[PDB]
Design a protein around this ligand. Structure first.
Ligand SMILES: Nc1ncnc2c1ncn2[C@@H]1O[C@H](CSCC[C@H](N)C(=O)O)[C@@H](O)[C@H]1O
Ligand SMILES: COc1ccnc(C)c1C
Length: 254
């Protein structure tokens, strides 16, 4: 009764996803602002830094990397959908058909103290991303045959509830992400709470409807220790998703 993974290869329209959720002209923009403030706190204020960050289930978005590129020498972006990776690559290569992230980039520049302007921030992110890879969080080796050094941080925004059909798969996906992380490395997860679907126009996608207690229990079961955990009450618009807020957490792998 859950969206098959192959649906993401064919029916997840990357440009329509960006238009619906990330235009930043709403509930969607309020959630985006909150995610950006937390990402800034984690990568710029807290000590989350290193040589390598792997972003899991990036989709076609780059908002979740704008503060991270200040703290990591390399960022690897990954997703199950090759269409999503191609949309990412249009932005990375600064193609005229790429999505316009400038209002979001400006917002992050403002949060960070106006030390830099938009073009410098975007160039820093483009220089940080060297690999754009296929991933499947449900597999013991999420990156398949591709080898990577153990990462200093694994980040995943709005991916795991969409990717995992049940709670045992969710806990296994957290272990599988841990196989990419060095001992003591950081796990940063942000996702919807209690959502059983989300929409991209008329296309429905399933989501696993977890509450905060089940998320925390799955992270401890998967072998991490949690440093902080935040719940926000703001939910998406009713035409988009049936969540009851969102969570953000930072944990370390044992
Ligand atoms: N098994 C799986 N492994 C990895 N990614 C998966 C997956 N199943 C779905 N996904 C990806 O999960 C993403 C959900 S949308 C989230 C996109 C982006 N990180 C954001 O913050 O908006 C999609 O890009 C989809 O392709
Ligand atoms: C589970 O809900 C989601 C999953 C992925 N992306 C978005 C934008 C939503 C609302």
């Amino acid at each position: 009764g859950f969206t098959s993974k192959d649906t993401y290869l064919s029916h997840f329209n990357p440009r329509d996803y960006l238009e619906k959720y990330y235009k930043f002209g709403s509930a969607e923009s309020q959630i985006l602002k909150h995610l950006l403030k937390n990402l800034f706190k984690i990568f710029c204020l807290d000590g989350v830094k290193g040589d390598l960050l792997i972003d899991i289930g990036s989709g076609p978005t780059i908002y979740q990397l704008l503060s991270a590129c200040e703290s990591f020498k390399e960022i690897v972006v990954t997703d199950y959908s090759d269409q999503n990776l191609q949309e990412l690559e249009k932005w990375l290569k600064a193609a005229p058909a790429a999505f316009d992230w400038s209002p979001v980039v400006t917002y992050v520049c403002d949060l960070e103290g106006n030390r830099v302007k938009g073009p410098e921030k975007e160039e820093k992110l483009r220089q940080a991303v060297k690999q754009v890879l296929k991933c499947d969080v449900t597999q013991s080796q999420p990156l398949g045959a591709v080898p990577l050094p153990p990462a200093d941080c694994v980040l995943s925004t709005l991916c795991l509830d969409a990717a995992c059909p049940d709670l045992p798969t969710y806990c296994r996906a957290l272990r599988n992400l841990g196989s990419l992380l060095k001992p003591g490395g950081f796990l940063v997860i942000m996702d919807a709470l209690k959502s059983s679907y989300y929409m991209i126009g008329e296309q429905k996608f399933s989501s696993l409807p977890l509450g905060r207690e089940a998320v925390e229990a799955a992270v401890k079961e998967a072998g991490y220790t949690i440093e902080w955990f935040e719940v926000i009450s703001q939910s998406y618009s009713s035409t988009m998703a049936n969540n009851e807020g969102l969570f953000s957490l930072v944990a370390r792998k044992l």
